[PDB]
Design an enzyme around this catalytic site. Structure first.
Site, mmCIF file in Angstrom:
data_model
loop_
_atom_site.group_PDB
_atom_site.id
_atom_site.type_symbol
_atom_site.label_atom_id
_atom_site.label_comp_id
_atom_site.label_asym_id
_atom_site.label_seq_id
_atom_site.Cartn_x
_atom_site.Cartn_y
_atom_site.Cartn_z
ATOM 1 N N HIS A 1 -16.120 8.075 -9.416
ATOM 2 C CA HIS A 1 -16.745 6.801 -9.383
ATOM 3 C C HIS A 1 -16.238 6.306 -10.527
ATOM 4 O O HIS A 1 -16.700 5.411 -11.220
ATOM 5 C CB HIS A 1 -18.281 7.133 -9.597
ATOM 6 C CG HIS A 1 -18.958 7.196 -8.426
ATOM 7 N ND1 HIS A 1 -20.454 7.201 -8.120
ATOM 8 C CD2 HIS A 1 -18.643 8.179 -7.386
ATOM 9 C CE1 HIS A 1 -20.989 7.851 -6.951
ATOM 10 N NE2 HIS A 1 -19.690 8.482 -6.449
ATOM 11 N N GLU B 1 0.916 -1.270 -0.029
ATOM 12 C CA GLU B 1 -0.060 -0.038 0.067
ATOM 13 C C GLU B 1 0.842 1.231 0.088
ATOM 14 O O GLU B 1 1.922 1.359 0.740
ATOM 15 C CB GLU B 1 -1.108 0.039 1.300
ATOM 16 C CG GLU B 1 -1.551 1.222 1.417
ATOM 17 C CD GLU B 1 -2.491 1.751 0.498
ATOM 18 O OE1 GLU B 1 -3.209 1.217 -0.229
ATOM 19 O OE2 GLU B 1 -2.407 3.284 0.168
ATOM 20 N N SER C 1 -9.975 4.504 -0.904
ATOM 21 C CA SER C 1 -11.090 5.464 -0.958
ATOM 22 C C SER C 1 -12.208 5.433 0.169
ATOM 23 O O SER C 1 -12.963 6.456 0.495
ATOM 24 C CB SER C 1 -11.727 5.714 -2.281
ATOM 25 O OG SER C 1 -10.777 6.355 -3.247
ATOM 26 N N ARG D 1 -9.170 -12.375 -14.548
ATOM 27 C CA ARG D 1 -7.901 -12.728 -15.081
ATOM 28 C C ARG D 1 -7.546 -11.946 -16.168
ATOM 29 O O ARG D 1 -8.450 -11.760 -17.236
ATOM 30 C CB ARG D 1 -7.737 -14.351 -15.286
ATOM 31 C CG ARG D 1 -8.112 -15.087 -14.143
ATOM 32 C CD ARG D 1 -7.969 -16.520 -14.623
ATOM 33 N NE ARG D 1 -8.985 -16.906 -15.337
ATOM 34 C CZ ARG D 1 -9.741 -18.094 -15.370
ATOM 35 N NH1 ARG D 1 -9.384 -19.172 -14.509
ATOM 36 N NH2 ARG D 1 -10.803 -18.190 -16.211
ATOM 37 N N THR E 1 -22.266 6.360 1.762
ATOM 38 C CA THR E 1 -23.395 6.220 1.295
ATOM 39 C C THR E 1 -23.344 4.717 0.798
ATOM 40 O O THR E 1 -22.517 4.204 0.001
ATOM 41 C CB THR E 1 -23.504 6.838 0.010
ATOM 42 O OG1 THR E 1 -23.690 8.270 0.417
ATOM 43 C CG2 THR E 1 -25.274 6.846 -0.241
#
Ligand SMILES: Cc1cc2nc3c(=O)[nH]c(=O)nc-3n(C[C@H](O)[C@H](O)[C@H](O)COP(=O)(O)OP(=O)(O)OC[C@H]3O[C@@H](n4cnc5c(N)ncnc54)[C@H](O)[C@@H]3O)c2cc1C
Ligand SMILES: *[C@@H]1O[C@H](CO)[C@@H](O[C@@H]2O[C@H](CO)[C@@H](O[C@@H]3O[C@H](CO)[C@@H](O)[C@H](O)[C@@H]3O)[C@H](O)[C@H]2NC(C)=O)[C@H](O)[C@H]1NC(C)=O
Ligand SMILES: *[C@@H]1O[C@H](CO)[C@@H](O)[C@H](O)[C@H]1NC(C)=O
Ligand SMILES: *[C@@H]1O[C@H](CO)[C@@H](O)[C@H](O)[C@H]1NC(C)=O
Ligand SMILES: *[C@@H]1O[C@H](CO)[C@@H](O)[C@H](O)[C@H]1NC(C)=O
Ligand SMILES: *[C@@H]1O[C@H](CO)[C@@H](O)[C@H](O)[C@H]1NC(C)=O
Ligand SMILES: *[C@H]1O[C@H](CO)[C@@H](O)[C@H](O)[C@H]1NC(C)=O
Length: 578
Positions: A513, A48, A101, A534, A108
């Protein structure tokens, strides 16, 4: 605690082998890591770029602080190209840290229309990706709480048959402890005057009308970020390792006869301070829809016409980075009377005809005759195959005409104003993301959603935004309306649709989005991944994140992404077991 368990020194993993490497500790990444390491014999390393942020404090843990984190180290703030609609760049907010994120989003929690997910199987030929199958994974991920009496009185409605109660992601009503504002019920009353439904549970398969909704938070209101839900309970697993503060740059490929095989990844923070780590089973890319495609390209997996001029050897030629689909958002805000005081959010999932109003007939004529639009989008480099793009557009026409899906969302916030953030849910535009340099660590890339480069997207956004102004001073909403503040003086109050089309390009943001950049659809249709995520033509390599949805959805996407991570994780484990 978790902090002491996290790896930060690259020398701890350099040259080592694990069973699976997951690039990106975000929503899908950590959900998948958690599922894979339930088998104690499976070793997983998550890599990360950011770090642990879940106990930072309210800037992360309180959903009502939404937006304060933007521009910090926890926001990637990916810059777009100079957009052709307004000659400006835009910032794409995206979480940087464990949870990705989910650290920074609005919380929501809603689902698409059944027909949308069904079409992933029936139109995009992803066997087993129909609503009922994906929904079963979504229910499994979910740990929802029903509303109490005060929450119901505000406008909540919870269908017990549409929510899991024994899963992992804690969800329930946002409740700041204030009284709830009457404006939510006024918005419902105002749309009911127009024949629009209210209170339908947006998690049941028909998101239409004005409803409240659950949010991804614990009962005590702490944000349910993916690291808190899927990593914090499990980090003591010795087979689950997480390295923070490093970027995955590329996938390491070796030849297995005729086919390249992903054997590991290179990671680091600058050219010249990189390291390798190897995977015995698979490399799984979960860096986000803006990033996973670039990682493929840096690795030699992408369009020869993009990679060759940059000096990258194209090992597998695929339309990586195309079919980018993000929405445009604009705001309409008004001051309210003191009787409108209180907390609450809601949203109008507005149909095509609700959106266009009296322009419906003309809008339908365009929809019926212009699908030209595919040729134009292809010419702009948003997609490569005109026939396959036309099929996507016929699919959206079917959704609109035969299923009457929601086409725009008008998202209401209260807590002392009446403010709408409004977006056209189903853009026809198609954009792209491509690398602009060979060096992964320079992060030099062109991310171009092509906002408003399709005429229907500009008309529909304009009409939706105009509708938000309209409803704000209609019916019951007139009770609380105390004059418009946005656009306010920037756009005459009696502006027509034409005037709104001129205004909108200079007053929008990305919706954040973005999907589609490694589309899960057949290769001949323009796909990058098969129905088990894949990558075509590569062994041991999957893309599993928001890159993969081939369409938008009339929904907020978390319910879909947790479900898809679970579904893909089972496919991966099926393969391990065989
Ligand atoms: C401002 C905003 C508001 C939102 N509001 C909502 C909402 O209200 N409801 C809803 O349902 N969804 C919402 N979302 C959407 C949702 O949060 C994302 O779609 C979802 O988190 C994407 O999951 P993912 O796993 O694809 O990527 P992410 O969760 O973005 O995770 C990707 C991870 O990879 C990391 N990373 C990046 N590059 C690299 C690299 N090279 N190597 C290693 N790691 C890397 C990132 O730091 C990140 O942690 C919102 C998103 C944003 C940005
Ligand atoms: C973003 O900036 C570009 C400029 O970099 C704008 O494009 C340019 O727009 C002008 C008009 O404002 C065009 O000029 C016109 O040229 C044609 C001939 O092709 C002529 O017939 C006209 O009478 C007029 O002079 C220009 O061609 C065009 N392109 C370039 C390379 O300069 C663009 O419109 C700007 N976009 C926005 C949203 O503002
Ligand atoms: C509740 O959910 C069930 C099962 O999905 C659904 O069939 C029924 O229509 C729903 N009722 C309402 C009012 O949402
Ligand atoms: C939407 O509007 C058109 C008129 O433009 C009408 O033909 C159509 O039936 C309406 N659709 C719905 C689902 O009401
Ligand atoms: C809303 O739309 C209707 C069209 O039926 C119009 O008559 C009315 O004045 C509009 N209201 C506002 C506040 O714009
Ligand atoms: C283009 O798309 C169509 C429709 O999916 C497909 O039949 C055809 O094979 C595709 N063309 C190529 C070159 O793959
Ligand atoms: C090639 O080698 C792999 C090792 O990762 C082996 O498991 C697989 O059967 C082989 N298959 C092909 C199609 O090359």
């Amino acid at each position: 605690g978790i902090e002491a368990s996290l790896l930060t020194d690259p020398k701890d993993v350099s040259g080592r082998t694990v069973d699976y490497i997951i690039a990106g500790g975000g929503l899908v990444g950590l959900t998948t890591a958690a599922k894979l390491t339930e088998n104690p014999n499976i070793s997983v390393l998550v890599i990360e770029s950011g770090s642990y942020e879940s106990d930072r404090g309210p800037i992360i843990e309180d959903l009502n602080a939404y937006g304060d984190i933007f521009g910090s180290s926890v926001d990637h703030a990916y810059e777009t190209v100079e957009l052709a609609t307004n000659n400006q760049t835009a910032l794409v907010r995206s979480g940087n840290g464990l949870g990705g994120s989910t650290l920074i989003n609005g919380g929501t929690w809603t689902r698409p229309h059944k027909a949308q997910v069904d079409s992933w199987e029936t139109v995009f030929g992803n066997e087993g990706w129909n609503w009922d199958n994906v929904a079963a994974y979504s229910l499994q991920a979910e740990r929802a709480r029903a509303p109490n009496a005060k929450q119901i009185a505000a406008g909540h409605y919870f269908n017990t048959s549409c929510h899991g109660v024994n899963g992992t992601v804690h969800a329930g009503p946002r409740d700041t402890g204030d009284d709830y504002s009457p404006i939510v019920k006024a918005l419902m009353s105002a749309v009911e005057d127009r024949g629009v439904p209210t209170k339908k549970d947006f998690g049941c398969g028909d998101p239409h009308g004005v409803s409240m909704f659950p949010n991804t938070l614990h009962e005590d209101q702490v944000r349910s970020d993916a690291a808190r839900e899927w990593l914090l309970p499990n980090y003591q697993r010795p087979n689950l390792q997480v390295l923070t503060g490093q970027y995955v740059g590329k996938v390491l490929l070796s030849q297995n006869g005729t086919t390249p095989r992903a054997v590991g990844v290179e990671f680091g923070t600058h050219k010249g301070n990189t390291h390798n780590v190897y995977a015995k089973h698979e490399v799984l890319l979960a860096a986000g829809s803006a990033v996973s495609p670039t990682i493929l390209e840096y690795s030699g997996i992408g369009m020869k016409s993009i990679l060759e001029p940059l000096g990258i050897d194209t090992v597998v030629d695929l339309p990586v980075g195309l079919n980018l689909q993000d929405q445009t958002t604009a705001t309409v805000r008004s001051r309210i009377t003191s009787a409108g005081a209180g907390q609450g959010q809601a949203a109008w999932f507005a149909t095509f005809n609700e959106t266009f109003g009296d322009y419906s007939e003309k809008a339908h004529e365009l929809l019926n005759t212009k699908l030209q639009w595919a040729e134009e989008a292809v010419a702009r480099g948003g997609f490569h195959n005109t026939t396959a793009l036309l099929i996507q557009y016929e699919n959206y026409r079917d959704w609109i005409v035969n299923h009457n899906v929601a086409y725009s969302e008008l998202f209401l916030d209260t807590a002392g104003v009446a403010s709408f953030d409004v977006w056209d849910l189903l853009p026809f535009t198609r954009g792209y993301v491509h690398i602009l340099d060979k060096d992964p660590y320079l992060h030099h890339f062109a991310y171009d959603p092509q906002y408003f480069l399709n005429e229907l997207d500009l008309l529909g956004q304009a009409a939706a935004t105009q509708l938000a102004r309209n409803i704000s001073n209609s019916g019951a909403m007139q009770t609380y309306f105390a004059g418009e503040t946005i656009p306010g003086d920037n756009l005459a109050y009696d502006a027509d649709l034409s005037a709104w089309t001129e205004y909108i390009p200079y007053h929008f943001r990305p919706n954040y989005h973005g999907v589609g950049t490694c589309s899960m659809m057949p290769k001949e249709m323009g796909g990058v991944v098969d129905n088990a995520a894949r990558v075509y033509g590569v062994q041991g390599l999957r893309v599993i994140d928001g890159s993969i949805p081939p369409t938008q959805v009339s929904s907020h996407v978390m319910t879909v992404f947790y479900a898809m991570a679970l579904k893909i994780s089972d496919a991966i484990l099926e393969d391990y077991a065989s």
